[PDB]
Amino acid sequence: GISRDNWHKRRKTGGKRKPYHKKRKYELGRPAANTKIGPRRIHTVRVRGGNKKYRALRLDVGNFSWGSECCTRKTRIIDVVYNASNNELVRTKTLVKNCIVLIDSTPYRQWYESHYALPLGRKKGAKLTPEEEEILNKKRSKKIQKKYDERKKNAKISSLLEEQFQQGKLLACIASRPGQCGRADGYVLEGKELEFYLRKIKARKGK
Amino acid sequence: ARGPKKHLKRVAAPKHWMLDKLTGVFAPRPSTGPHKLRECLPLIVFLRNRLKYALTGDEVKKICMQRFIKIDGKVRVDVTYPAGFMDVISIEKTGEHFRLVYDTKGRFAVHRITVEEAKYKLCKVRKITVGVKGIPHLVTHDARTIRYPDPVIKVNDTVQIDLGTGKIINFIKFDTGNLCMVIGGANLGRVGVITNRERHPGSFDVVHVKDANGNSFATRLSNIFVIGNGNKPWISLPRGKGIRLTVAEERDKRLAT
Amino acid sequence: TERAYQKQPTIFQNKKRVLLGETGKEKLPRYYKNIGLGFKTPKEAIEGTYIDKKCPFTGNVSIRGRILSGVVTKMKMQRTIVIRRDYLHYIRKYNRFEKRHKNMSVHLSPCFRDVQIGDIVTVGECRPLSKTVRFNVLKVTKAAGTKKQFQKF
RNA sequence: UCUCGCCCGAAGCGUUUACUUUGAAAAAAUUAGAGUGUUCAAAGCAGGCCCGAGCCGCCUGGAUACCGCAGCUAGGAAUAAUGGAAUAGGACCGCGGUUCUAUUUUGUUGGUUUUCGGAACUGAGGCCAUGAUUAAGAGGGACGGCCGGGGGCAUUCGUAUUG
RNA sequence: UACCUGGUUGAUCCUGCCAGUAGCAUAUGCUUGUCUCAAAGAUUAAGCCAUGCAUGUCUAAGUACGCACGGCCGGUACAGUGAAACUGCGAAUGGCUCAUUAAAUCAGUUAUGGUUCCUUUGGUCGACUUGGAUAACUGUGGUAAUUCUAGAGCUAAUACAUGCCGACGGGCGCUGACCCCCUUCGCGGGGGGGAUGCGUGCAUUUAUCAGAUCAAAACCAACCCGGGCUUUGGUGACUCUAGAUAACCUCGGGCCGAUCGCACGCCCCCCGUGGCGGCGACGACCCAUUCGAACGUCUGCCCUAUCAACUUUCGAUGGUAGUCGCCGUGCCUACCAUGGUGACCACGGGUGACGGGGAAUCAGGGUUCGAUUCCGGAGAGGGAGCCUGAGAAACGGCUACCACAUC
RNA sequence: UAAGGGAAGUCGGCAAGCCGGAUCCGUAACUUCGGGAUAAGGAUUGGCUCUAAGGGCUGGCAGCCGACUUAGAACUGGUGC
Numbered sequence A: 001g002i003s004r005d006n007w008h009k010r011r012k013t014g015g016k017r018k019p020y021h022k023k024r025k026y027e028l029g030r031p032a033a034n035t036k037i038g039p040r041r042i043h044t045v046r047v048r049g050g051n052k053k054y055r056a057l058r059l060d061v062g063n064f065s066w067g068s069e070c071c072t073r074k075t076r077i078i079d080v081v082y083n084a085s086n087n088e089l090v091r092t093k094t095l096v097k098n099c100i101v102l103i104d105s106t107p108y109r110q111w112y113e114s115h116y117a118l119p120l121g122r123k124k125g126a127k128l129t130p131e132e133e134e135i136l137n138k139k140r141s142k143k144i145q146k147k148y149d150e151r152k153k154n155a156k157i158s159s160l161l162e163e164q165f166q167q168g169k170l171l172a173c174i175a176s177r178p179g180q181c182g183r184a185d186g187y188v189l190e191g192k193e194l195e196f197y198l199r200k201i202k203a204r205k206g207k
Numbered sequence B: 001a002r003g004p005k006k007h008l009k010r011v012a013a014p015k016h017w018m019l020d021k022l023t024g025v026f027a028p029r030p031s032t033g034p035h036k037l038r039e040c041l042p043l044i045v046f047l048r049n050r051l052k053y054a055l056t057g058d059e060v061k062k063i064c065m066q067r068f069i070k071i072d073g074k075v076r077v078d079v080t081y082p083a084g085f086m087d088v089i090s091i092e093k094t095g096e097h098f099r100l101v102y103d104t105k106g107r108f109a110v111h112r113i114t115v116e117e118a119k120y121k122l123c124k125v126r127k128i129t130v131g132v133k134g135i136p137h138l139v140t141h142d143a144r145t146i147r148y149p150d151p152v153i154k155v156n157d158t159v160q161i162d163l164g165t166g167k168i169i170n171f172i173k174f175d176t177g178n179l180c181m182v183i184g185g186a187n188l189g190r191v192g193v194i195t196n197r198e199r200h201p202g203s204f205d206v207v208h209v210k211d212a213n214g215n216s217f218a219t220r221l222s223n224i225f226v227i228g229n230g231n232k233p234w235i236s237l238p239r240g241k242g243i244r245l246t247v248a249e250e251r252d253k254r255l256a257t
Numbered sequence C: 001t002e003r004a005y006q007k008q009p010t011i012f013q014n015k016k017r018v019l020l021g022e023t024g025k026e027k028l029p030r031y032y033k034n035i036g037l038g039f040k041t042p043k044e045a046i047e048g049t050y051i052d053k054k055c056p057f058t059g060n061v062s063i064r065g066r067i068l069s070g071v072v073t074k075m076k077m078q079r080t081i082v083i084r085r086d087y088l089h090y091i092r093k094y095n096r097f098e099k100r101h102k103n104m105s106v107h108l109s110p111c112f113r114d115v116q117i118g119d120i121v122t123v124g125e126c127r128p129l130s131k132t133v134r135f136n137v138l139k140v141t142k143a144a145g146t147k148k149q150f151q152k153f
Numbered sequence D: 001u002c003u004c005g006c007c008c009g010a011a012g013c014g015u016u017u018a019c020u021u022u023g024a025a026a027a028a029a030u031u032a033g034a035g036u037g038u039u040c041a042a043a044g045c046a047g048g049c050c051c052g053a054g055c056c057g058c059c060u061g062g063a064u065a066c067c068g069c070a071g072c073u074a075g076g077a078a079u080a081a082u083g084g085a086a087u088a089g090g091a092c093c094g095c096g097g098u099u100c101u102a103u104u105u106u107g108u109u110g111g112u113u114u115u116c117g118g119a120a121c122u123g124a125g126g127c128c129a130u131g132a133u134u135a136a137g138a139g140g141g142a143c144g145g146c147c148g149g150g151g152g153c154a155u156u157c158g159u160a161u162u163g
Numbered sequence E: 001u002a003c004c005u006g007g008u009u010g011a012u013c014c015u016g017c018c019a020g021u022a023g024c025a026u027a028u029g030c031u032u033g034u035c036u037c038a039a040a041g042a043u044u045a046a047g048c049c050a051u052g053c054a055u056g057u058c059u060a061a062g063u064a065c066g067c068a069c070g071g072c073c074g075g076u077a078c079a080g081u082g083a084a085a086c087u088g089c090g091a092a093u094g095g096c097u098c099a100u101u102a103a104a105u106c107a108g109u110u111a112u113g114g115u116u117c118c119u120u121u122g123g124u125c126g127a128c129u130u131g132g133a134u135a136a137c138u139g140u141g142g143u144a145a146u147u148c149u150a151g152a153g154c155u156a157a158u159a160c161a162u163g164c165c166g167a168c169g170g171g172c173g174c175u176g177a178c179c180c181c182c183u184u185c186g187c188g189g190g191g192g193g194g195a196u197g198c199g200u201g202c203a204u205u206u207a208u209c210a211g212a213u214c215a216a217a218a219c220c221a222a223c224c225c226g227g228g229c230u231u232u233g234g235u236g237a238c239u240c241u242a243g244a245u246a247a248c249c250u251c252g253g254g255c256c257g258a259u260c261g262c263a264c265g266c267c268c269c270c271c272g273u274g275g276c277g278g279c280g281a282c283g284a285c286c287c288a289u290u291c292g293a294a295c296g297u298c299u300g301c302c303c304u305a306u307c308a309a310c311u312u313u314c315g316a317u318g319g320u321a322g323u324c325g326c327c328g329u330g331c332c333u334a335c336c337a338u339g340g341u342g343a344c345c346a347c348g349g350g351u352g353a354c355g356g357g358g359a360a361u362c363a364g365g366g367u368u369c370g371a372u373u374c375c376g377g378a379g380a381g382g383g384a385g386c387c388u389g390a391g392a393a394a395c396g397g398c399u400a401c402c403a404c405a406u407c
Numbered sequence F: 001u002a003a004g005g006g007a008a009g010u011c012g013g014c015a016a017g018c019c020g021g022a023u024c025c026g027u028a029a030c031u032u033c034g035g036g037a038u039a040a041g042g043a044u045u046g047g048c049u050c051u052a053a054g055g056g057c058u059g060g061c062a063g064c065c066g067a068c069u070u071a072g073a074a075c076u077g078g079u080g081c
């Protein structure tokens, strides 16, 4: 029965704002979307004006955008670290608008592998999974197409992002709201704010 | 309160309907439509007061729904329809045909026109936009969402629209020299010649006009409606060139009669 | 820079600059905006490394509505100040006047440096920025007088 | 300024108001007031005329006004406030240059080095009658020969009075 | 009507007050022939209420196998008047009352570029019929009770659902087997046409990019010719609208028609078993227009200092990240700073304060009322809570407590 | 220790019994302005699993190693601390 209204506040002074409403209809506040990382279970909530609103209760997917190479993929959510507004929802694994999320690295390997090949994340296995890059042999100008892709740009991603792909992880940031639109959509942390939130997580996991 | 109001008192009605108190408590509140409550006139005032056909407000419910009085060539059957400035009434079999202007004293004047103004009609653009798949749409204040219009219709212009096709022609554009007529505010009904705009960046425009005999006035573009290009209206025009005389000259208009 | 949990406006940072191998300078790709109605954006906004959510030059908060004045009396509040505005209210019966003042709050864009206490400012209207802050800094008229002085230490 | 198409638009695009007059802007109702023989009058927004039906009838009326204060625009620059240039870091004109980058032509496309506009900055001269309203029968102050049972500190003195 | 008379003394003159004086609006008394408009349980009790009422609803057009009525009557079923019912709107308007509340409602003002909107007005609207239930009905019933309600068999849909036929693929999105030459001793190096395969559109929601005013060159690597070649709209302001790129799209599944009335007519044939389509009703994807609503800005308020400092832990002012909500905000929550208002009367009281538009009084200027038809706010005994709906914290809606209170 | 009642017992609440430690709250009459005052009246208190804050020695803004306290949150027990 929470009301987000501004008639039970105080004035610029501090004198008690005497009431003349009775907490009307159009000033509700509903209880929150304590969002979890379970299987998909989305409640819907009727709005003023009849519109539809999608409570995110438990979610395991999310559509995120690899911003640099301009890729965007459906992806699994693994782990939730550093909410940056409360240091307590990191425990609860709760998703809000700006909450930094560990993401599994599968749908971003295979885009970059099949476009900018001799791929990443194999630790020099030296006997490990020879999967159809060593068989195609690229007789045509498609090899010479991909030669510009390969070393003229030279496509060096941000240094440490190799190590996330060594590990099967990817550190990203949400930009949508979970409980209001029913999605958890965001973008992948790159470069400067990659190394920013890295030292935040390291020192908070350190001490 | 709660939800929309749906009555209108006789005292609280707009004065430019000429409504009278001691006839009854209530006034005919129009429907929602192309004209707001201060830029409108119902059918029930137009037929029962001015043309004076019917005397009860339930017979007008019959003859608006006997499918004879139509607007623009399609049949409108409300008893409280919002007919406003610059609208066309047709009556299909029994031939009468109407154009709506303002009387210069502030009233809505009767003005009886022929079939060569069934063929066209003027209207003022309210906004321009682009719509889905890159095409232009253009929203006219007569609630006309009309598309693929033209390239050179600015936002504050006037369009000579046909009713049958629903397709524009002869798009006159706002520029100094024109003939214009004020549709709201403190100089309503006056017909004049466009003289000076001032584009303030304070969310408005403001307009000085001269008129026919040169005399100056001032109001805003939204209130204003363009009627022609250079002292010739595209419309026929009632009682002179739309002229407020003087208070005393209006008396001596009645004496020399 | 930033001394918070994070700040960064709208601009796509990580442009993958490197294809031959160079650092150069890096802080170039910046957002920028005019405010119209005859007020010039300062160059403090352009070589300003700070990031603001509520600035009229830097942020999304456009200026509709009104124009008013004030004098900057207290600056003891984060990123916002408290103007004061005297005027001459009129009384009908006595046929005379009386001074009044009504203290307003206004969000101080920190592009305006050296805005020191007592100088005349001009404000513009915005959305509800906070409980009391509905106004926004638009032009700083006075540089608090002495643009020449030197003193002891 | 004629960057835009000898005069005009437009463009560089202004230290503010206060006050004053216009101009907008307002809801009627009520009030002042018009008009009308509601039988006069308080009312009300009514009616007036011709056609012996005979024209698938004419004309006008349902105005005008004051709408405090406040906000807006355009005219007025008296009085009353407030501002610049005093360590000149000024008004104005022509120059040295650092380095920033801007699209058009080099058939195209790219490359390198520029003429090149502006933002930034830097160096120097001249240029301006180069800059400070006068000293209130206003006021603060300095000054110097007096004057005062002014004030405080200290001592000297007097008759009395009582013992 | 720009207006005074009596009253202190033995007498005057004078500050003075009391008394007359004229309205006005409630009462009260004496009285009253007619006629025109005509206020009227506001002041004390927003104290309690017996009683009958005040919200109902059908077009040729959602549903007729009713036991009602009879159309001309044969079976190719469905012609008409259709009680009652489901369904779609509507009861959130109009009415009443002034108890609340003192920058609060409101009033003059500006804006949503920071939002939602039933209706009305236009745009877009690229398997010859699938399915269970369901009322109405029939009975058979229950306790004194209410506008209570159970089960057994059938029946309709614009109640509810499930779900495809049209289609020529346009060309981009990007993979990709292949194909034509110069050079050549061969590898190699240098340019050009194209089978396979997944995407497709609008809305939801993410991320990026292009998102423009300029007037001249030396060649260096090629090479289109005869020295020489291509460009959305708006504001004053965009993170505007529109494009292009990558993908989701929530089984509590954005739309992308399994509807109805009125008449007919055209067609070429292998029957017509195929086609060929005029007018209106209905309701949905969003964009708008209107009726709105809301939160906003500037200025404005009655007496009180025997109310002078008040406010923050449980936000008091501000900063950032977020929840929420229709969106903007301490609106809440987290973290962090230490602020905000005051003699220009804040804060704390009083009010016989609903605010205005207005009314009375008539020189001028004021003074006192304004619950009272018009606009706006509030509340239905008190005070809390929510279903349905575009709209309610509804009360001639519902639940619970308290106070009354009937059977 | 004692169901129910709670000074009715007695000369008298004698003796017993309540209240106690702590943190956050909140505090009058009265006054020699020092007080009263730990006034009265309250709320919490366990267990475990964590976060937040308080440091020290070397450097050309980093790295090694250190004391036991203070607030916050979850979960759990037969409302028990």
Ligand SMILES: [Mg+2]
Residues within 6 Å of the ligand: A202, A203, A204, A205, A206, A207
């Ligand atoms: Mg750690």
Ligand SMILES: [Mg+2]
Residues within 6 Å of the ligand: none
């Ligand atoms: Mg001497």
Ligand SMILES: [Mg+2]
Residues within 6 Å of the ligand: E018, E019
């Ligand atoms: Mg008396």
Ligand SMILES: [Mg+2]
Residues within 6 Å of the ligand: none
């Ligand atoms: Mg008296």
Ligand SMILES: [Mg+2]
Residues within 6 Å of the ligand: none
């Ligand atoms: Mg009652």
Ligand SMILES: [Mg+2]
Residues within 6 Å of the ligand: B001
């Ligand atoms: Mg009402």
Ligand SMILES: [Mg+2]
Residues within 6 Å of the ligand: E098
């Ligand atoms: Mg009251």
Ligand SMILES: [Mg+2]
Residues within 6 Å of the ligand: E294
């Ligand atoms: Mg509200």
Ligand SMILES: [Mg+2]
Residues within 6 Å of the ligand: none
């Ligand atoms: Mg409102």
Ligand SMILES: [Mg+2]
Residues within 6 Å of the ligand: none
């Ligand atoms: Mg807090």
Ligand SMILES: [Mg+2]
Residues within 6 Å of the ligand: E361, E362
């Ligand atoms: Mg008077």
Ligand SMILES: [Mg+2]
Residues within 6 Å of the ligand: none
């Ligand atoms: Mg007066």
Ligand SMILES: [Mg+2]
Residues within 6 Å of the ligand: none
């Ligand atoms: Mg009302």
Ligand SMILES: [Mg+2]
Residues within 6 Å of the ligand: E394
């Ligand atoms: Mg209510």
Ligand SMILES: [Mg+2]
Residues within 6 Å of the ligand: E395, E396
């Ligand atoms: Mg009701």
Ligand SMILES: [Mg+2]
Residues within 6 Å of the ligand: F002
């Ligand atoms: Mg016992």
